[PDB]
């Protein structure tokens, strides 16, 4: 019996960080990062388990079926918060196009959204747990033809067909440039707002610009956080896979290697997925700043 590093999901010592994503104007979604990473970690465990031996290669689409049903179940719990979620969307809709009452509305609905996620903790936890029980069951039943010379074809295959592509996608993008261009945009909006919010007094616009800029700095912070992780994990992953790929290991060492790799991947995938999603929301809110700033013509 192994030492899994994604094990507890009901250890209140570490806060369940919730990410808000507003990719397109008028749409909203959320991710409970602990749950996302957990679920993904056991997705890599399951695949590395069926790919280690050639006899189980074909069973891939049955694992895909399971994972999909598990995901389908998790989405059903997220949709139980749709009321508060939609209540927040229309609030932002009114706020982007009273401001005290408007902001009180935003704060109340946003807090009710998080409170909702707390209400369904047990439901999410069960769905994640069934996935752990599955991945662990498969991984526990992982065997080699010779326990002293275990094959590494499963690790190699899984990495090439599931993880490698994302490493190249990340390397092709200059994420640090994306953050420098985003800081440039935020500094620009602050300059144009402070210079605009000096005298000419029209209530409505000033408040909307200040609000969108606030949101954009929060989204930026999340992008910087994930990009940082993505860089760390890209070097780590690329440098580790090299040593677990073309050789054989003892059963115990092989499982230590697979666990470690699965945990790395999980953190990488999580923050990558979130990075792209928040990138889309940052430029979605930027388009609204361009519109409101352009709409500032006195004719």
């Amino acid at each position, epitope marked *: 019996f192994l030492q899994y590093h994604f094990k507890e999901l009901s250890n209140y010592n570490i806060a369940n960080s919730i990410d808000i994503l507003q990719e397109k104007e008028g749409h909203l979604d959320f991710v409970i990062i602990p749950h996302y990473t957990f679920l993904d970690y056991y997705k890599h465990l399951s695949y590395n388990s069926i790919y280690h031996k050639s006899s189980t290669y074909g*069973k891939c*689409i*049955a*694992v895909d*079926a399971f994972i999909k049903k598990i995901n389908e179940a998790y989405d059903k719990v997220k949709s139980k918060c749709n009321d508060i979620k939609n209540d927040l969307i229309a609030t932002i809709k009114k706020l982007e196009h009273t401001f005290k009452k408007m902001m009180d509305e935003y704060n109340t609905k946003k807090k009710k959204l998080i409170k909702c996620i707390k209400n369904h903790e047990n439901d999410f936890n*069960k769905i994640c747990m069934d996935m752990k029980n599955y991945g662990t069951n498969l991984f526990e039943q992982l065997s080699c033809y010779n326990n002293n010379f275990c094959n590494t074809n499963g690790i190699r295959y899984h990495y090439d067909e599931y993880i490698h592509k994302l490493i190249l996608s990340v390397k092709s993008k200059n994420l640090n440039k994306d953050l420098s261009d985003m800081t440039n945009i935020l500094q620009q909006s602050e300059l144009l707002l402070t210079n605009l919010n000096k005298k000419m007094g029209s209530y409505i616009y000033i408040d909307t610009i200040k609000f969108i800029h606030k949101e954009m700095k929060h989204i930026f912070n999340r992008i910087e956080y994930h990009t940082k992780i993505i860089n760390d994990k890209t070097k780590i992953i690329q440098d580790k896979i090299k040593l677990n790929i073309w050789r054989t290991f003892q059963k115990d060492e092989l499982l230590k290697r697979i666990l470690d790799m699965s945990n790395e991947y999980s953190l990488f995938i999580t923050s990558d997925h979130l990075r792209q999603m928040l990138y889309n929301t940052f430029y979605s809110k930027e388009k609204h700043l361009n519109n409101i700033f352009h709409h500032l013509i006195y004719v």
Partner: antibody
């Protein structure tokens, strides 16, 4: 929001054949299968067969072997079921259910233990002269 | 392959604890699905494998059993629960169903 929508009810004379469609929706039909279970009037549920959306493989019940055919059209993600040479004891309600993609696979199926979760409203088939 | 339930026509009230047994001819390991069907409606999956009742099922249903016999428990009957219940075998692809247990309100 995942659903299976079956074809309209049928009235068929004994000996004729019937095709019952089960059009799936809002899931990845290609990585899932479809079973078929029928319920005579007043009696229980009797399994018919299973057909995958990956392999296009099939497992037909021994009592119906040769008389039943069932294919899959992943372009429209629809599963069909054709029962030929109908007889009076075939009068029943026909149901289709979302199943595992490898049911009667070579070895184990400990990769998807969930039974038949999503189902269809059903299709009443009347075999009477 | 031969599924045989215990009670054919059970009679319980709202709040009662209801237990339905499902015995088999041969050995099944953990593969026994439970289903609920109201007359004139398509069945609904309740539990699969041992006690893994798929999401959206009342957190009062339960399944205990291995080998030839199993049980479906409803800790506290609600008005919606009055329907007929079935068990299914899936150790081998040739699925088989139980005779069904109709749950009636006892007045």
């Amino acid at each position: 929001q995942v659903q299976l929508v079956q074809s309209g009810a049928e009235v068929k004379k004994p000996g004729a054949s019937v095709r019952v469609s089960c059009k799936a929706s809002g899931y990845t039909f290609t990585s899932y299968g479809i079973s078929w279970v029928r319920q005579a009037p007043g009696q229980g549920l009797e399994w018919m067969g299973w057909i995958s959306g990956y392999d296009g493989n099939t497992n037909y019940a021994q009592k119906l072997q040769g008389r039943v055919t069932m294919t899959t059209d992943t372009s429209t993600s629809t599963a069909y079921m054709e029962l030929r040479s109908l007889r009076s004891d075939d009068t029943a309600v026909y149901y289709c259910a979302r199943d595992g993609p490898q049911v009667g696979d070579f070895d184990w199926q400990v990769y998807y233990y969930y039974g038949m979760d999503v189902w269809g409203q059903g299709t009443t088939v009347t075999v009477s002269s | 392959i031969r599924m045989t339930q215990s009670p054919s026509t059970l009679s319980a009230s709202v709040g009662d604890r209801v237990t339905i047994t499902c015995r088999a001819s041969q050995s099944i390991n953990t593969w026994l699905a439970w289903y609920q069907q109201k007359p004139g409606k398509a069945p609904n999956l309740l539990i699969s494998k041992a006690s893994s009742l798929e999401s959206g099922v009342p957190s009062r249903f339960s399944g205990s059993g291995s080998g030839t016999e199993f049980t479906l428990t409803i800790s506290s009957l609600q008005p919606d629960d009055f329907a007929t219940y079935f068990c299914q075998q899936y150790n081998s692809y040739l699925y088989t169903f139980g005779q069904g247990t109709k749950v009636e309100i006892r007045r």
